[PDB]
Symmetry: C2
Subunit: 161 residues, 2 copies
């Protein structure tokens, strides 16, 4: 249980963000309890996935990572450098808490999104991805061959077709 | 209300800022024996919806589970705007991106309570922000409650008023 709210049906359907918390199958970092604040110190909605793992505090546990995807209208270059407008699903944010990286949490988060969006990794665009995320994509999803862009998004060979 | 523990680095990098605040006029009304009627609701457990943007949720409170009666989402956006004489102008104001109060409770002052809370806490006036594709009811809201009447025509789907400049 991650939320304690009741939503009217209309508000829920028009809710500007889609959010999912899933449980996971180690050094615990320091945490803060969030109560009423997160992040503090015909519409195509982005989908935020959060991963929980642990039984701290009678099962409450800890959110160890998040993944945000979404549709974005992108003007891309193709294989022959021709221009092409398109609206793929994009990874917009991807993070696992530092001390728990390289423990498989990211893979779990990413896999859940694929299964449920029924998209493959080569069919998405990646917004300004970090070195670690590139490595992750190259090593765990065999995404090796990129088609050069000038708009800060990365897309791989399979995307075209 | 949330029941999660966030690591500090994850919290600081969290891609969205979200705030839930309790309603005063909802509390006052219930307290004086004339609470507003709640529609049928769904209990959320692990699913919602089935420069960071800031999402505000207004809770009608119980002391059990309250009810979210409205939401307001703002965020900074880089915009290429036209001014009053049509000169081009790039600027990055706070924008309203989404604004909704559940249907049966519209026109009870709830939208005003959310909008006022955002203005105080973001410390902006309504004329200094831009409005992304606002619905007719929201325009009405702006015109009637905040005296935002004079629009400066744009071609990019955002609405801004004279005071903005
Ligand atoms: C487009 C944007 O959203 S950019 C994403 C934001 N990320 C950052 O700023 C820094 C790193 N942050 C992270 O959250 C993670 O490292 C992620 C999200 C990229 C991957 O999630 P993890 O839980 O770490 O991935 P998981 O453990 O499932 O798989 C591990 C693989 O990811 C990569 N990886 C994870 N940590 C590192 C690291 N420190 N250096 C290099 N590669 C790394 C490697 O491919 C690794 O495989 P290896 O152990 O065989 O070298
Ligand atoms: C940028 C984007 O997000 S566009 C906004 C999305 N809106 C919609 O899809 C439809 C309407 N949805 C709503 O959620 C609301 O009516 C809001 C958010 C626009 C205003 O919230 P409320 O809680 O209803 O506002 P509040 O009760 O404080 O003030 C009422 C004023 O809003 C306006 N308003 C509210 N409902 C209506 C309506 N059916 N018709 C016309 N104006 C309305 C009027 O100006 C009204 O003043 P009046 O009663 O003197 O005419
Ligand atoms: K509360």
């Amino acid at each position: 249980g991650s939320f304690t709210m009741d939503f009217p049906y209309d508000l829920n359907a028009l809710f500007p963000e889609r959010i999912s918390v899933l449980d996971s199958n180690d050094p615990l970092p320091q945490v803060t309890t969030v109560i009423d604040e997160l992040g503090k110190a015909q519409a195509n909605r982005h989908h935020l996935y959060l991963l929980k793992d642990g039984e701290q505090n009678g099962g409450r546990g800890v959110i160890v990572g998040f993944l945000k995807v979404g549709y974005k209208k992108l003007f891309l270059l193709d294989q022959r450098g021709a221009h092409l407008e398109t609206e793929p699903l994009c990874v917009l944010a991807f993070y696992v808490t530092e001390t728990l990286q390289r423990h498989g949490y990211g893979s779990e988060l990413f896999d859940f999104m694929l299964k449920h969006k029924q998209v493959e990794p080569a069919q998405m665009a990646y917004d300004r991805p970090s070195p670690k995320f590139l490595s992750f994509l190259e090593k765990r999803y065999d995404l090796r061959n990129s088609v050069p862009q000038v708009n800060n998004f990365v897309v791989f060979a399979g995307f075209f077709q």
